[model samples]
Target chain A: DSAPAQRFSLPQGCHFRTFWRDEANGGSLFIPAGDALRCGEDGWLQGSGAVTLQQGGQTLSPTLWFLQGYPLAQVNGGDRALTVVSANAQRLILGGNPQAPGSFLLLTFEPQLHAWAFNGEAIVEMPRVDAADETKIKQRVQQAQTAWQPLLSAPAPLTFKLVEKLAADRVDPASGSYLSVNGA
Target chain B: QPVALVYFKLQPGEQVSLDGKPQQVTAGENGFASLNLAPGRYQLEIRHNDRLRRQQLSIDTAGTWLVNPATAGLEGS
Candidate 1:
């Protein structure tokens, strides 16, 4: 049985933050900059290829960052198994202008292929090694790669905007901090 | 026992596994589905070819339960 679904809206100039269970320890925040806000013909917002984190103030390395492109509005829901649909390519940027030096991470989810991405890297490349439908998963991943390859290769910069800011104290490893923003 | 309502969004031909066993589901127009179950510890698995996702849940068999599709690894009360 499925669970009740919730939805939220990201205010203009606000970025979505991913938080860990505990908030006492340092956590990473993803800040986007430049043209990552344009909506595609299908209506999903395109992603920009830049991101910055509060950790080391380092911008994310040029690796591919996976992201969840919600069709509706901002990220909504609590602890549950959430999957951001990936029917097409979504361009995005990870870190924004770092006050100092730091790094940012990117994330993505592909349902058909049962794969996910962290900082543009495939963390869970594929799922269910032993299943009657394993081949279907592989095809889904391949299709996703093909759709996303061009966007990943030539992602435009995200437009700079003042999203919500976080308190330094909120940044902890145990309970990571994040900033959710609405892209243009 | 309280009935637990389980909702899901599966691809056209995707099948979900309950306790390591596969349960079939036919995705609707929006590619979504819903189900009801008895309270207990169950491992929910979904698969379509190589793509798969799974999670474990413990229901009290009392009030209603909700799960989100985006974060498939965990559950909420």
Candidate 2:
């Protein structure tokens, strides 16, 4: 489903929210990047910038920052966000820096699904550039948008509803990057 | 025959136990709790503060085991 508003004039980042519900299993499972959505781990959605999330009657706004490629979320400000451990869906797990390893504040819609998603075009606000480079930045952003248009047309595949494990290498948790079994 | 090799990525300050024995763990250089077990059933528990997670694990054959704590109900206290 498309967003209500037209694509905004903002630099967009990678899409991290498109999810597929497995129809074969009665949609009891959701998959993203070929992995099943884990409640406390993969439930948090990473955005290109600060985002406002609402669940029924409540609304939460968390500032997002990237540390070592992991999107960390912080609210009301302090240190960079890191490891998030939630005791339950009703509570927010807030964490501090990586050294301290604070909780991850759960702020995604659809509480019952144990799934969170980031969708549509996001406004990636560039850091304040010099006034002289303002026009240049916009022009570059426009060109990037054009380059991303082809990717936007890419939709969920027909096998999205099918559940099958593809022979993919798992990333080493230590590096948070690709790891080949041949090396180990 | 090769034994089952299991690894669980842990957050900082988190503690884990295998079959009631507290195992050494980390979230830095060796972030995964490496456990070598014979092909059989075992219990895994992780703790942090007042929160605790318990999971039943089974390994039928020799291979790498991936544990999904979320599915095992890690949100329980």
Candidate 3:
């Protein structure tokens, strides 16, 4: 007889959100409670877990570790873990081990083409340059120009130097380059 | 034997100097190069367009180590 199909589900009170940076290109999914998901250009999805957070949900797969609890203010200070799963099914099951009680799971969806970040309080998501919404793109462009204006007014002068190390055999002159060691 | 994993990013047409010697390297697809060296103290210089950037680092001849460009903070001339 075949073994039972593995099923993973978040515990009660767990909340998840799915956002798209670009619908044209497949984006990523984020599970804020414990892990952040990123779908790559090749259609492979990778998961990064929060070390300090615990997963309140139950996972069928022993490998699936979820975040159940986390410190409110210093959430990012904990360790981070990651995993990757095949996207054969629309809903992928994840596993997790919770460290404490009264903690809920958070899930998020993200696209691989763009970059995303979760800094404890908020999840900052951005769309791809090609598929970016017009209004948002315009605002970003203006913000970038405003930020760069100060640098143009007072440009810093460039400097140069030549450094070398003194070795037992001889005084090694410094070159402006990195040395590559082959064959270990 | 302890190994030092030296990773660096060089600008286009840039050359690196090791221990005061000029060694030319073509940046790969990643614009980065990796060098494995025995544990020892070495002086590094990065040159691009005739400008020299100098820095020094000591690789403990023990376990694997990664040297980042930002940490070296070498001065360029």
Candidate 4:
């Protein structure tokens, strides 16, 4: 059975973040950077070639990074980034700028596919995992959400913003850790 | 009981064997085969285009894992 879904809107109608949701299922899917995007069974997404976001005919390179196990995408020249924070069988929480007003996305999954719709059109494939793996996926998802709960409740720490600024200056800012919580 | 899950993202015809047992063909466009087992240690032998690669993993808890060919190993939660 599907649950009630949450709607999202940018403050003042300023398209700070490029948001996409499934029309039938409300959950969000993070479009990876590249010409062709694919989802790995581990819940991570991959891109084949140059991935760019187009808005008003302007192609913008996005800053994609991992924060506490969740993936975040901050398209250049925008105030907020689209964050894929948490996921479960029922819902996926995609957060906008945590500090900004009206910046949270709550979406439900499509019943048939149990996957989120991309751009309200295409259906992203979900990994077919057995029962044990399913339980593990749910537990890890809870852990990811728990790790991100602090920033969701309050503003992100200073180090995170600093890392964001620092990574933006890199030549290849596709996927790398400027600052990791465990300090690897 | 909690267990670990490993997603081996391989080519369409690529082959994967976990602890000497060959896995079934992947069903998705991403071409991924999953390993579900109790948390501990495991071995992976991957075959693609006639090339063979081996990897070792140390799973500490119940979480999802991915084969990072970049490091010739695994990345887990």
Say which candidate scores most in DockQ: 3
Q: Give the Å error, residue B58, model 1.
A: 1.6
Q: Name the regions of candidate 4 deviating beyond 4 angstroms.
A: A1-184, B25-29, B70-77
TM-scores (chain A) of the candidates: 0.29, 0.23, 0.16, 0.24
Q: Judged by lDDT relative to the true structure, which candidate is superior, 1 or 4?
A: 4
Question: What's the CA error at residue A158 for candidate 2, in Å?
Answer: 49
- Candidate 2 Cα lDDT to native: 0.36
Write down the DockQ of candidate 2: 0.02
Candidate 2, residue B41: CA error in Å? 0.9
lDDT score of residue B51 within candidate 4: 34
Query: What DockQ results for candidate 1?
Result: 0.02
TM-score of chain B of each: 0.68, 0.73, 0.66, 0.68
Provide i-RMS per model in Å: 18.0, 14.9, 21.1, 17.4
In the range A1-184, model 4's lDDT, one tens digit per residue, is 1333332222322111222445543332323334343333443443222224443233333333222222232211122234554454333445444343222233333222223211111011112332136464444333433433343322222111102221222221211322222200
Model 3, A79-184: lDDT tens digits are 2332212111111111121221111111111112111111111111123442235565444333433332222212222111111221112111112212211110
Q: Sort by DockQ, best first.
A: 3, 2, 1, 4
Better of 2 and 3 by TM-score: 2
CAPRI-style grade of the A/B interface in model 3: incorrect
Docking class of 1: incorrect
Error of 3 at A16 (Å): 38
